[PDB]
Write a protein that binds this ligand. Structure first.
Ligand SMILES: NC(=O)c1cccc2c1O/C(=C\c1ccc(O)cc1O)C2=O
Ligand SMILES: [Zn+2]
Ligand SMILES: [Zn+2]
Lengths: 456, 222
DNA sequence: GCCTACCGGTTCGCGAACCGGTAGGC
DNA sequence: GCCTACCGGTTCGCGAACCGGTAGGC
């Protein structure tokens, strides 16, 4: 990391490191019962100490010049151990009672709609606002990159909470994990106590947070880099970083009429809170997504299906394709375990865009997903391994698009019929879900841009 | 936990928020807990007991609202209770309990300032260590636990966390650590404890124990 | 051969000064 | 969270005083 500007000597003297270990640590301590939720940043520029309640004006600091440089190590490692409990070097860290815990820090030639697409998916201040509702610390999280091993442990804590919640474990068991999580990921609750992770959807909410937070740091990783040479334009630099060939499907096109039909037709009768309106259609072609999908063009039963996600995620979805949840993450929220989920209805997928009356525009995908021999399920069931000969899973719903009106498209079955009753009604799903447990089975075809019209 | 706080001045150093003069040592003073601008934690705003009631604060029931009320001396509790404002068997057990509650209050207080007269802090520290007790921080708190130890008994370790239980207002709260991240939350009115063993070194133990002290358990407020 | 006024040097006694660890304050 | 007045424990500084060696007087 760099120098903290609270010292006032940020662009004057560099932060020091002895060979490998960088003399700079950002500590944290939270007790849900007491309500305390504090930070403690220590640095060696001069030694600098910062402290207070995370996400508020509560706190203070002390910049202090040293007599010498060897006295700095003495003052630093002493203050460290006094506050954290451990020594500066260690094989594995161990938390101590009421001591702190250290957090692991690390002229454009394109169409106007394509420029707006980059404008939409690379505006990171819009992604910052998106995290404000989650109550993630807004102050120093953009400049302070939280580690990968750290976030995996944060995922693991959430998965431990769901396990604890499922079999009605002790309050202390839950209290610990709630403490552990908020220490590991600094939240901003202001002057009130951190809430306990006791619900089944509270972990899901914090699981969703980590998924979104990850993609913002990924969006930064793309934006920060490349070769800054005076030749290409700023928007073109960010386009090449996406590693995809995007094209604008014209409104006069015959294939464009199929998508607008697929949007208009497959709107849910129950999801009447908003009304869709297709602003644009983009044909999308990822780098080497056809090379990996060649295997599954042999596979039968291929369907063109919807898949929605936050506008913040589309920065990463283009660069890495659709990814399955990590093995550390909790299975809560998922109906049939971790995998890529798809729907035959635009509305059901469109809810995952997360739009409001203030933020109307949103993005939704259409991917040729090779389902193949399907494993059909009625009720929710967290699966680990698929049955023999099955390449996908299907969640059977009440309403299904008319199978006698299934139009084809480049050798792909597009179910753009309106809703009718299904074959079986002993299910706990209202609409269909299509699940693949391999990132190779998906092949993204179209990206849409949709305006939402509410009534308020 | 509580908004307000009352005690005898632990030092004649802190000033009074209203009049801004030094609150003298061992004097009845009241506080109001506020959020410190300088760090993540509550801080007491100490007042002179006289000055406390002119700021406009009106504690309806001191015993349930103000912290450290039960730890005060009995006659001083009544001063706070009065100044705050400005059937046969039922009333008998009710009235006879308040008789026994005063009996227990000023029994410990007689024992407390008896040890303050005869023993130094290091004697009281090594008293607790001999009985396998955690030595607390503070002068007032040390003889408070020694007096608790002698009258009722040497507190045995906690069931799960193996920490030290401590009397706090209305119960014995565990102050140990169930884990490194979280503090233990064991609470009880009837804790486990063996008998208090005074070492041989006590030439005034026969005088202190001669103050009509028999076997009895901790009595609590209603 | 004593005595004794004078001087350099060691010890002794006690209050000032020093100091590290800490309970109380904000 | 950090600052600092307070506590006990040891040291330090300096003048009284104690003391032995001595040279001018009778
Ligand atoms: N992505 C979609 O637009 C979508 C469409 C239809 C069904 C699902 C979808 O997502 C699901 C589940 C899901 C499960 C966990 C999670 O963190 C996020 C999720 O979107 C679903 O079950
Ligand atoms: Zn006053
Ligand atoms: Zn305990």
């Amino acid at each position: 990391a760099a120098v903290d500007p609270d010292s006032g000597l940020e662009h004057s003297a560099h932060v020091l490191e002895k060979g490998g270990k960088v003399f700079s640590a950002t500590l944290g301590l939270v007790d849900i019962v007491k309500g305390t939720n504090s930070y403690y940043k220590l640095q060696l520029l001069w030694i600098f100490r910062s402290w207070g309640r995370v996400g508020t004006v509560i706190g203070s600091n002390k910049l202090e010049q040293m007599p010498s440089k060897e006295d700095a190590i003495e003052h630093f490692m002493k203050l460290y151990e006094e506050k954290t409990g451990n020594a500066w070097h260690s094989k594995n860290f161990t938390k101590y009672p009421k001591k702190f815990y250290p957090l692991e820090i690390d002229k454009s030639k394109l169409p106007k709609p394509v420029q707006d697409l980059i404008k939409m998916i690379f505006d990171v201040e819009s992604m910052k606002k998106a995290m404000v509702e989650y109550e993630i610390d807004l102050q120093k999280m953009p400049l302070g990159k939280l580690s990968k091993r750290q976030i995996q442990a944060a995922y693991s804590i959430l998965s431990e909470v769901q396990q604890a919640v499922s079999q009605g474990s002790s309050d202390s068991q839950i209290l610990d994990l709630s403490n552990r999580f908020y220490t590991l990921i600094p939240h901003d609750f202001g002057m009130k106590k951190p809430p306990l992770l006791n619900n089944a959807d509270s972990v899901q909410a914090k699981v969703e947070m980590l998924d979104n937070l990850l993609d913002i740091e990924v969006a930064y990783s793309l934006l920060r880099g490349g070769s800054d040479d005076s030749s290409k334009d700023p928007i073109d630099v960010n386009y090449e970083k996406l590693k995809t060939d995007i094209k604008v499907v014209d409104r006069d096109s015959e294939e464009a009429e199929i998508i607008r039909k697929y949007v208009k037709n497959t709107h849910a009768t129950t999801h009447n809170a908003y009304d869709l309106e297709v602003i644009d259609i983009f044909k999308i072609e990822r780098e080497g997504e056809c090379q990996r999908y060649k295997p599954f063009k042999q596979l039968h039963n291929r369907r063109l299906l919807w898949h929605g996600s936050r506008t913040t995620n589309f920065a990463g979805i283009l660069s890495q394709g659709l990814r399955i949840a990590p093995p550390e993450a909790p299975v809560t929220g998922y109906m049939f375990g971790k995998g890529i989920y798809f729907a035959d209805m635009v509305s059901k997928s469109a809810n995952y865009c997360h739009t409001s009356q203030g933020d109307p525009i949103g993005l939704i995908l259409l991917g040729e997903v090779a389902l193949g021999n399907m494993y059909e399920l009625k009720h929710a069931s967290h699966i680990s391994k698929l049955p023999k000969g099955k390449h996908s899973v299907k969640g059977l719903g009440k309403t299904t698009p008319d199978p006698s009106a299934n139009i084809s498209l480049d050798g792909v079955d597009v179910p753009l019929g309106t809703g009718i009753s299904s074959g079986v009604n002993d299910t706990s799903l209202l609409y269909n879900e299509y699940i693949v447990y391999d990132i190779a089975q998906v092949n993204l075809k179209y990206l849409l841009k949709l305006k939402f019209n509410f009534k308020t | 936990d509580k908004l307000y706080r009352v005690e005898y001045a632990k030092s004649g150093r802190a000033s009074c928020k209203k009049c801004s003069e030094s609150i003298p040592k061992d004097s009845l003073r009241m506080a109001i807990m506020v959020q410190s601008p300088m760090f993540d934690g509550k801080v007491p705003h100490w007042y002179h007991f006289s000055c406390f009631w002119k700021v406009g604060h009106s504690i309806r029931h001191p015993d349930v609202e103000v912290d450290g009320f039960s730890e005060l001396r009995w006659d001083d509790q009544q001063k706070v209770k009065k100044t705050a404002e400005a059937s046969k068997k039922e009333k008998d057990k009710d009235s006879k309990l308040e008789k026994a509650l005063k009996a227990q209050n000023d029994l410990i207080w007689n024992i407390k300032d008896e040890l303050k007269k005869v023993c130094s802090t290091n004697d009281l520290k090594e008293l607790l260590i001999f009985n396998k007790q955690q030595v607390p921080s503070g002068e007032s708190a040390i003889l408070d636990r020694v007096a608790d130890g002698m009258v009722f008994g040497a507190l045995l370790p906690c069931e799960e966390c193996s920490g030290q239980l401590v009397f706090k207002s209305d119960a014995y709260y565990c102050t140990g650590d169930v884990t490194a991240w979280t503090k233990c939350m064991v609470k009880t009115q009837t804790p486990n404890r063996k008998e208090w063993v005074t070492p041989k070194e006590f030439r005034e133990i026969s005088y202190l124990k001669k103050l009509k002290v028999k076997k009895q358990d901790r009595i609590f407020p209603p």
